[PDB]
RNA sequence: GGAAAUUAGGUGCGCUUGGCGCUAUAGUUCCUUGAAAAAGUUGCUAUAGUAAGGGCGACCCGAGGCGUUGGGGAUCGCCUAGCCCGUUUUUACGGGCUCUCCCCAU
DNA sequence: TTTGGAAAGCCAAGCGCACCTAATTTCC
DNA sequence: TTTCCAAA
């Protein structure tokens, strides 16, 4: 009952092997699969929703004020007022308001318009992009041409003669926030000179306060919550790198670890030399190894350990190149401290440097910085948090230090650094200073080992988190079947930049109980190179190769690697784990394992071992979450219905993105109402070689009736057909579908029917109730009634079994096409992982267990059998006998 | 393999802003089709919508991940969960306890 | 029905933290 | 990657 576990872990799969190294037999093998980054669309959607909401609120706050300050009676009045007929362009009104009184209506439009877009405001703390160049250029245009305001620039300047708003993803019209504030103030001023009653200084101040309001990049404890904890004191936060304690610790560690070598040997610096290097670092901006040699007058027989001196030993060049210490944060803060006069007694102390470091590292807005440095910061639970100096600093200082930017933390808390530094000051190495302070420098886990792996610390990297948690489920399933392993051999694929390898090794080593044995490393990391050589040499050379690799990994120890090097040394003047190992591996990876094992000489497996023997069945992780993108993003117009009941949609499309045929024709909506534009585009496309980028890299004009040049043509509406759309914005647009949540399967008079359920259906009161009819519009799909029996719901990667009726077979297609005369396999029946449904055809798509074959467009209506199964972690599956059609109810 | 530091990078997660794109409507503009009624096209500007939908004014949630169980999953719960006890490994170690629902298994 | 495949919202300008790599050092 | 269209 002792075994070796082999594990092959990627970001999308865990191959595994149970091997008995004494019996010299493969016990059991398998594969668990779990197929931008995952959170990015969600994060971006979050940002978009907030931006739009905050803009709307700003306009709403302004409209509420306009009532209260007496520009209108109420909001109902205000809306009607402004939704009267606009005569003059609001940009022209913005310019007119500089030299004449604006009417109430004109003024209201101007104030709303100014609040739509607030311009660029840098948050930079440390090449210039297209936004910065345009902001700078626009600022220069206004300064040099004497434009009184942004609007005056935008109306009068040649740069904006064709458009004011930005087009085709350029940033020509982006201006500074400050220039728009100048405009607001100017217009309130000029309106007051021209006797506008609604331009009072009170109104001005409330307008600017509303217009200017914005949230800081971080508020309160937000940064503190992201900062990690001390390696030694895990309820402490990590210290800022800008703190004195961090910088002095780092300095002392560095100097104490210097080593110098001559022909005789290697030595450290003495206490006298250290003091000299330490004092130089505290006064000089940067220190090189050259400055270290110079301050100590160190003989040219000595070299510093760790430098590359090459052949020539051009010592000044090598040593001058290498900066050993640069206490930037210290010197920057020390300069600001020296601008601030102190009383005769007191001096700037370590706690002042730490306090300012904390303030600027843990907080980014001026309100939090100010409160903290005034010693009255309240955290997000209203609890006072005094600064480290317990000091209310002066407004002068707070103002001055807020010009600095600090960031980043070390691994250790301030408390830990306070205890360690005194021992580093006595010249100890880092490790011994830690010991002297009362800390185990390795922070070794004191925790008790466990029979199954405990839950994993949830980490923010969703791909790494999935891999580790799936690998845990595999290991724990295998422990619960076979008991504890003697060792675990692990290989990883490089897909997480080393995070999975480092995490997983340490986690298993620290937490898992191994079966009692003499073997030293409980966790053995094998190289892909060695694995790859053995597979080639053994001629063992899809999802099954992960299982193969898990076998090789399991039987790869260091003692076996020696036998390969012994062989290659001997051959210079091939090792197998056991007899028939190749043939056994091939047997265990095959569909007919029993037949292949029994074909080996001399009852290679016992009668028991053969009775237990199943073919490998790859286990695929279920995906049964009902959240997801609700529908596609772009809004479309419905312009008609096809004969077969599809929606005809249209959407404005840039000339470069239009789809043209051989003749340069395209599906332009309203072609009949614009032959000049239709013909101009087609003609332009044909002039060039159907090179769309070349053709549409210059302006195209619509010809006027007289034949001279009229307006530019940048896009037209293109028509396309779609069965299923959803209305948005009170039916003012439609949108297409995104991923299907689940497919509900029904039976009626021995035929099968499919009802796709979309994310938009989760908001409804009732489930959708129409099963697909191929090539017909939604109106002609069939309403479900008592004649249909509900069978089950299929999510992606649910397991199905189908049997085709006798008149035909299912054509499985090889995922990887080959030199074979046959790249398809036709089967009467199949167990397969469901992928989805084609709503135009009621035909499905699936993959066989290991992903090596698939089918697509398989109609279900006249199958002989259609059943649902479910798979466990290790590959066993179980028939679903009965399901209820579940309602769908998000908490949102 | 493990701790800390440095230099140069990488991946991910979170946040604040800016500007578009698309849709709808109004004006203006290029007009086109149509006997007419009408319908619609090009450019510019404005105003509105921009997950679907839900909860209470620098309002909030809403496309991600994980937990579970006899074995699995979630629309449930959580996102660095909660709540106790033991212990001088008291910033640690140990041991208790725990929502609703669906499928499978005995 | 099966097969082949087009389309899908996007970029600029920053503020942060976590984890990981390569090289270098002192250490268990 | 996924929906689902039009071609085969
Ligand atoms: Cl532009």
Residue numbers in the entry: 1 to 35, 44 to 134, 139 to 504, 664 to 712, 718 to 749, 758 to 1076
The authors write:
Cas9 enzymes commonly adopt a bilobed architecture consisting of recognition (REC) and nuclease (NUC) lobes, with the guide RNA–target DNA heteroduplex accommodated within the positively charged central channel. Cas9 enzymes recognize the PAM nucleotides by the PI domain, and cleave the target and non-target strands using the HNH and RuvC domains, respectively. We confirmed that BlCas9 exhibits robust activity with an sgRNA with an optimal 22-nucleotide (nt) guide and recognizes N4CNDN PAMs with a pronounced preference for A at positions 7 and 8.
After extensive crystallization screening, we determined the crystal structure of BlCas9-∆HNH in complex with a 110-nt sgRNA, a 28-nt target DNA strand, and an 8-nt non-target DNA strand with the T3CCAAA PAM, at 2.4-Å resolution. The sgRNA guide segment (G1–C20) and the target DNA strand (dG1–dC20) form the RNA–DNA heteroduplex, which is bound within the positively charged central channel between the REC and NUC lobes. Notably, the present structure revealed that the BlCas9 tracrRNA scaffold contains a triple-helix structure within two stem loops (stem loops 1 and 2) and two stems (stems 1 and 2), which was neither predicted from its primary sequence nor observed in the other Cas9 orthologs. Stem 1 (A67–G71 and C80–U84) and stem 2 (G74–A78 and U104–C108) form a triple-helix structure, which is stabilized by two base triples, G71:C80•C103 and U72•A78:U104. Importantly, the N4 of dC5* and the N7 and O6 of dG(−5) form hydrogen bonds with Asp1022 and Lys1040, respectively, explaining the observed requirement for the 5th C in the N4CNDN PAM. While the nucleobase of dA7* in the non-target strand is not recognized by the protein, the methyl group of dT(−7) in the target strand forms van der Waals interactions with Thr1025 and Ala1027, explaining the preference for A at position 7. Similarly, the dA8* nucleobase in the non-target strand does not contact the protein, whereas the O4 of dT(−8) forms a hydrogen bond with Lys959, consistent with the observed preference for A at position 8. Taken together, these structural and functional analyses revealed that BlCas9 recognizes long, promiscuous PAM sequences through base-specific interactions with both the target and non-target strands.
